[PDB]
Every structure is written in C-alpha cells, then in structure tokens.
C-alpha cells in the first residue's frame, strides 16, 4: 500500500498561532491528497480534497498545499475548536492514511504536585500489593517517574496512565502503579517514587516505609 | 437522512471469528459507491481494512489482511459485511464503515468496538488511596470496559482525575480515580467514590478515609 | 507521471449523462499552450474554464450557478489556473518522447475499380498530400482522411482514366515519416 | 479551436444508466488509454505508452465527483434526460483486400449519443466472437461519441460479413454489410 508519514508527530500550539503539518508519500499521488480531522469519540471529518478547502462550509482558516509527493496542511490562525488529531488520506478504493498529528494546547510550564500511596490492607487480604504514585496537574506531558524499592531501581513492574489536557487549566496528570505480591511487597522496607520533571529544579522523591 | 450504522462488535476469543455488518440508510448501494472498512486501534492511528465496489463487486484488501478478513455486500439488504477470521489480540480496534473516502459530502459510521480477549467478564475491586492533599480509588482487575466513577455521588466534580484504564499482564483492566481536596476537611468532610460496572452489575461505594 | 485534470465539485430507457473534458490545445510546440475545461450536461456544455479568460464562465443558463460558485472559491481558481502547467505542459513532455515521435510509413497501392484508385494505407501522423507526367486535377476525387482508431490513417484517391500512347499515370505521396516521396507507376 | 495538437487529459464520463462511467485520455483524436474502473488498471492502447503510469485512483475519484455533479444537474434541470441520436455506421477494410492474405474489418459506429451501444459481427448469417475488438467511447466536439469495432478476417471468395449495431436511436438493429 502507498505509505505516507506526517512531519510533526504531535505539536503544542496556542490560540491565534499558525500551524503547519506535512504529509510525504512513497510515490507520486498527483494533487489527490486529502486532510481529515478527528476529535475524540467521533469519526473523521473531511477538511480538504485535492487542496480545495471545501465542504458545505469548512472554516476558511484551513488551507492545503503541495502536489506530487510532498503536501502541507496550514491552519492560519488557530481557534480553540481546532485541538484535534489531523490525518492525511489517499485513495477511494485503495485507501492510505497518515500517522496522525495531534494538535495540543500550549501553556506555562507547570510542575507536578506529586503524591505516593501505599497498598490498602483490604488489597493485602486479596494477596496482592499495588503502590500508586500520582503526579497531579503539570505541563508538558514529558516526565520521568522512576520506582526505587530499598534504593535499588525497578523496571518491569510499573504501569503509567496519563489523562488528557484539562478542560480548565490544560494540564496533564499521571499515575505510575508499581505492582508486587503480598510476599514480595513484605520482603522490602522503603518504597520510593522519583519524579523528574522539566518544571522542577530537582527530582522530587515522595516515599513511605511499611510502618 | 443519509447514515451508516455498524453492528457486531464485542469480545471475541483469539483464534475465533466475528462478522460485522454496516447497514446503509438514506441511499441505495444500487447507485455504486466504494464503501470501506477502516479500523482504529485504542488510542492509535486510523488504518485501512478493505473496500468494495457496490456495483461490480471489486474488492481490495490492506497488505496486513492476508486472507483473514473478508468483505462482502448484499445490495437488496443494502448492508456491508466483514468476516474477521483467525483474530489475534493485536486486532482489537474500533471498526468504521465509510462511503467514498475523500470525496466531498460523504459520510462515515459511528464505529463498532471489537475487543479480542480470552478474558471473561469480571467485576472490579475497589480499594482506597490513603490520604492541599490527595485521596482516591484504585479500581483493579475487571473486564470488559468501561467503569463509571463519580465522587461524593456527583457532588464532588472540581479537581477529579479519573485515569484512562490500563491493560495489565493478567489481561484484565485497572484504572484509578483521584481528587485533590484541602488538607483541612480530611476529618470534617466524608469522601466516597462511586464505581459502577454495567457489564457485570458491580456497583460499589468505597469511603476514602485517613488511617 | 500522467497528470489528470480534476473535475470541480458542484454544491427505450432514460439516461442522464455528465461529461468532463480537460482539454489541452498546443500550438508552436509549447509556445502557445491553452487549457479549456468543459463541464457538460447531456450534449450541452454548461460551464468552461478557459486559461485565456482565466475564470469559469457559463455557456448555458444551467451552468451559471456553477460558474459563480467555482469563481467564489479561491482554491479552485488557483488550481485551474495552474492546470495549464501541471496538466497540459507536463503531459506534453511525455508526448514529445512517444506520440510526437511516432511515424508509420504509408503503403501506396494503385489498383483499378468498378478509373484507378490509389490507396494510401496505414500511416501516422495525419499529414499527407497525395497527387496524380502532368499534375492531373479535374478528374481526381479523394476520400476524406480516414481515421482507423488504431493510431493509423488511410486515404483513397480515385482518377478517371481516358488513356492513350502508353503514357504512365503516377501516384505521388508525401508524408512526415518518408525521407523522400513515394511514386507508384501504372 | 485552432492548434497544432489537441488532447483531452481527462475524458471523464458518467451516465445514470447502469450506472457506468469511462475515464480515458485522448491525443489528437486517438485513444491513449482507458482505466478499467472495475479491475482498477490503466490499459494502454499504444505499446510505446506502457512506459508511463496513470494511477487508477485518479480515474475512480473523478468518477465519484462526476456522479455528484450529475445528480445536482438532474434536479436543477428538472429531470431532463438525454436525446437519442441516430448512429451513422460505416464498414471498411484496414488495407486493400487480397484474397487469402489476412485483414481487419473496421466498423465505425459514428454519432453515438447517449454512449450506450452494442456492436457485433456476422459471417454467413450467424455471429462471430473470435477476432472482435473495439475502441472505448471516443469523445466528439459536439459532445456525442463514436466507437470502432474490428474483426480480424482472412478474406475469402464466398464469405460475406456484417456489422450489427444496437443503439436506442435505431428502432431495429442497423446491419451494415461489407463489400470486397
Ligand atoms: C442497449 C442495448 O442494446 N441493450 C441490450 C439489452 O437490452 C440486452 O438484454 C442485451 C443482450 O443482447 O444486450 C444489451
């Protein structure tokens, strides 16, 4: 199949800004590249066909450029209803799509309010132990949360989960969950979480001992 | 009006098969349209599956298909089919049904969720997260998605972060929901999370309290 | 690659026919290049983008809403203006190496009939002059040029003969493929 | 109007009957290629053109736009259908006939409108299937069409041949006869 890749894998931009995403194809596809938009939960809405920014009415701020293999989607002045996943498309019967570009809100580099939680007694009855680590509200998403158990690092026993940009303050919250058995958890004493963020002078280490 | 409706999604064991349908309303296949099955992973990009010329019957499949999926149609029933055989957990995604991709004034479908797991429906296990200060609920080992989480029966809304679910090595899901409240009410105000799991009728109301 | 011209999008049985002909006119090689893109309902041309005019212009009333609608969209005008180069000029370069290089030599054949018919057959391109030891003109009838549709032409030239003294009658064919004219005696 | 060469880099056609369509390119009145909209393949009508590449998706996409444009123009013109034209059939041989030496029989079916027609060949009463080939619908300046069928024959002394045309304009099949 014709493979086509998008230039910014994801980007952070502000309202009013100019955004440029590119789509390069494996072959010449003439002037037949199309730009699709996708807000969460919905199927794609077509923005441009050929390079004609048309619909029964699509916002004139969107524009398509390029011919042959290299193409460019340009949103002149970003509006807030434009934070969406953008895709490039080719083919009516032999369909190819791009490795989408996420368009994310940019903001003041915030620091993560970090917290640790030991496993409950109710879960230790069950025979397992999950140690959580919250990194409430921060910017940008890029953050390293390492698990230290008795000062020795931990690799294949944690799992992170990141929320989307907040609807009020546009920040991300994270949750790395170290999971052990109620016997392996009982064999060690210090359990630490080492958050290392951009908006932090030094790596914060919130921690607990079993008693 | 003109719309396409997906049907047939669900949990299907690896190795087993699933047949989806795509009913068309508002138009007749008789007028020949190229209708396609485009699938989209959970949180990943749009990927093509197959297309069929509703006039002649001409089929095209994506390179990754290799005789595993089989598109077909019934013009009398105006329905599209996709027989997905030899399914792996890697094939778990949302299956869209779209008419004339890239041409203007052309519709897509809402989606149909196909989940490929050897997991069996299980109610979650709600545990508290020991408490500005933060408290929460660990909602461990359950299947299939999704889980409703409300704080203080809806009363608490600001500052709540219900984390996206994560698939554990056990094949079962596990999400957390945390909130930040002033450290003053840690004895005054009473906090309760409201987990719900319609797939296995498991409603829970855990009271989060300091130890 | 072969670049196509794109259609502009509008907002005893019965048949409804729509034709879109992206047409390129070339004169003095690529010196004078012209695109005229015709939108046609049944056999009536409704709209037209002429690269000389530079805009969509209705031919019939039925194509007036379309002409204004396509003229309001600035993307469509920029694209239709560029089609002269992207489509006509681009594709012409390929023609120079293939169709404009094609040449099939005419096979001249004099034979009597139910009066002599000089059959000039299987030749490409369409340029040809067939003539019948003085240039006989009044007693000669040529058929129009015959297009065979397989990228070859034919043309027949009949001459009413009133002969005497064993004088020779000669068919003289001139054609781009031929490095010297063909003469056939009778 | 006047040029040294004229080409149609897009002879896009879409009709309600079927429905059906035809994407072809033409250079100087001859058919360079057609895209089979079913098989999805550029079929070169000239060997020397096989070196180039035309993407079938380009043809398929224009035919989808054409379907749209047609539907709106059906409503806008208050459902006005096409007028059936009388096809002017003509039969002739590709080269002077010499008995025993192979030849091609050309049936030009001129002035076809709408472009929906049947063209078959007859030898001594019954139909011929082997050796028959035909060009796509070739566009005209007056927006009608024309097709050319071909029957590869070995000219015989007794044998007679006919071209059987079946357009909606004709009330009974036109049977043009071929005379050596
Ligand atoms: C336009 C036309 O001639 N249509 C005929 C159709 O009615 C007939 O069923 C078929 C078989 O001969 O050939 C075609």
Numbering used by the authors:
A (entry chain B): 1 to 211
B (entry chain A): 1 to 131, 140 to 219
C (entry chain D): 0 to 10, 1003 to 1105, 1114 to 1131, 1135 to 1188
D (entry chain C): 3 to 182
Paper text:
In human celiac disease (CeD) HLA-DQ2.5 presents gluten peptides to antigen-specific CD4+ T cells, thereby instigating immune activation and enteropathy. Here we generate a TCR-like, neutralizing antibody (DONQ52) that broadly recognizes more than twenty-five distinct gluten pHLA-DQ2.5 through rabbit immunization with multi-epitope gluten pHLA-DQ2.5 and multidimensional optimization. The complementary binding specificity of the two antibodies prompted us to engineer them into a bi-specific IgG format consisting of a DQN0344xx arm and DQN0385ee arm to achieve extensive coverage against multiple gluten epitopes. Structural analyses show that the proline-rich and glutamine-rich motif of gluten epitopes critical for pathogenesis is flexibly recognized by multiple tyrosine residues present in the antibody paratope, implicating the mechanisms for the broad reactivity.
We determined the structures of DQN0344AE02 - HLA-DQ2.5:DQ2.5-glia-α1a, DQN0344AE02 - HLA-DQ2.5:DQ2.5-glia-α2, DQN0385AE01 - HLA-DQ2.5:DQ2.5-glia-γ2, and DQN0385AE02 - HLA-DQ2.5:DQ2.5-hor-3a at 2.8 Å, 2.1 Å, 2.8 Å, and 2.2 Å resolutions, respectively. Notably, the antibodies used in this study are engineered variants obtained in the process of optimization of humanized antibodies, yet the identity to DONQ52 is high (VH > 93%, VL > 94%), and the paratope residues are conserved between DQN0344AE02/DQN0385AE01 and DONQ52, and except for Glu28, between DQN0385AE02 and DONQ52. In DQN0385, Ile29, Ser30, and Tyr32 in the CDR1-VL loop contact Phe60α of HLA-DQ2.5, and Tyr50, Thr53, and Lys54 in the CDR2-VL loop contact Asp66β and Arg70β of HLA-DQ2.5. In the case of DQN0385, which is reactive to both HLA-DQ2.5:DQ2.5-glia-γ2 (IQPEQPAQL) and HLA-DQ2.5:DQ2.5-hor-3 (PIPEQPQPY), Tyr50 in CDR2-VL contacts the side-chain and backbone of P6-Pro in both gluten epitopes by arching down into the peptide binding cleft. Similarly for both epitopes, Tyr32 in CDR1-VL contacts the side-chain of P5-Gln. Since P5 is mostly Gln when it is not Pro nor Leu, the cross-reactivity of DQN0385 to gluten epitopes with P5-Gln complements DQN0344, which recognizes P5-Pro and P5-Leu. As an exception, HLA-DQ2.5:DQ2.5-glia-γ1 has Phe at P5; however, this is strongly recognized by DQN0385. In DQN0385 as compared with DQN0344, the series of protuberance structures are less pronounced. The Tyr residues are spread along the conformation of gluten epitopes, giving a shallower penetration of the peptide binding cleft. This explains why DQN0385 tolerates bulkiness of epitope residues.
